[PDB]
């Protein structure tokens, strides 16, 4: 016999489980008691198959730490695989983030460096926030200052062009730093050459 609330439990699995368990749940929910018995018999194995897919994906998309952990996890016992997916993976993930932040500090400007430095000495959550949005905010501040400097130290055309970009959007300041300031130099050089 089946539990009086067996269908309710299956709907639960349908809502929260992986693609395998969810599809299997649909057959049990749409069919009769036999479909339910078949689902329950296989469900302990189906959940395992879903667990393998998630770990297998991390083996491809994660960083050096997480990828290695996932590659071994997919060959472990069901209980061991779930421990990895539930929490074990988190440490490898944090380590991958630490390295990426460190990399940004070495390459970025004063803003990025100060923000990254603080992130490294903080918590895992703070490191994630920096990686997710904080590093972009920091880069924009570095960009704004560089434009402001050109506005005061460059030649006539560099000065004016930087001035226009400085009062515009972040996108305008970036285009100026990447391309526009080079055109402006060329114009200052042309002026000096013709004048001579």
């Amino acid at each position: 016999p089946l539990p009086a609330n067996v269908r309710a439990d299956i709907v639960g699995y349908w809502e929260t489980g992986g693609a395998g368990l969810k599809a299997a749940a649909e057959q049990a929910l749409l069919g009769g008691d036999e479909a339910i018995r078949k689902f329950l018999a296989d469900a302990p194995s189906i959940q395992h198959d879903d667990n393998r897919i998630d770990a297998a994906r991390m083996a491809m998309t994660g960083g050096s730490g997480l990828r290695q952990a996932a590659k071994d996890a997919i060959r472990l016992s069901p209980a061991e695989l779930e421990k990895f997916l539930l929490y074990g993976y988190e440490e490898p993930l944090d380590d991958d983030h630490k390295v990426e932040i460190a990399r940004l500090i070495n390459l970025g400007g004063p803003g990025v460096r100060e923000a990254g430095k603080a992130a490294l000495q903080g918590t895992a959550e703070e490191r994630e926030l920096f990686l997710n949005s904080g590093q972009y905010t920091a880069q924009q501040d570095d960009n704004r200052v560089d434009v402001a400097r050109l506005a005061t130290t460059g030649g006539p055309n560099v000065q004016a062009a930087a001035k226009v970009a400085l009062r515009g959007t972040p996108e305008d300041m970036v285009e100026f730093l990447e391309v526009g300031q080079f055109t402006a130099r060329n114009r200052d050089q042309e002026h000096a050459t013709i004048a001579e």
């Binding site: 297998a56 083996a59 491809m60």
Partner: protein
């Protein structure tokens, strides 16, 4: 029966019944075996008996086996050339490096429930 080699995988009928995998034609240098310290090329899927191993007898070698809903492969001491096919009939080739793990559609970049079409040994 005639003692002529037709290159059809020996025992394929029993394998379909027992492991759920099916095999067709090859050059005879790849055998299906157990996964117990004798692993060489290992195939994982969400069907049949979950997984199974193959042993390379000689190089080059090939066997056009078919494994529905495949998601990963293990390699050892050799590069492996794998052909998989999507649900729309389109096939692609993935080159897996020696002594490493790679994934397919479902656990790859597309998320598609692809099928293993051909397993080839360099």
């Amino acid at each position: 029966p005639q003692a002529v080699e037709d290159f059809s995988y020996p025992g394929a009928a029993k394998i379909q019944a027992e492991t759920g995998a099916i095999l067709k034609r090859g050059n005879g240098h790849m055998l299906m075996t157990s996964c117990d310290g004798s692993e060489d090329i290992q195939v994982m899927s969400r069907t049949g008996q979950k997984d199974f191993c193959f042993n390379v007898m000689a190089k080059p070698a090939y066997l056009t086996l078919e494994v529905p809903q495949a998601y990963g492969i293990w390699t050892s001491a050799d590069p492996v050339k794998t052909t998989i096919k999507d649900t729309d009939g389109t096939a692609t080739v993935i080159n897996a490096p020696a002594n490493d793990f790679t994934g397919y559609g479902e656990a790859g970049s597309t998320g598609e429930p692809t099928t293993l079409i051909e397993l080839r040994v360099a």
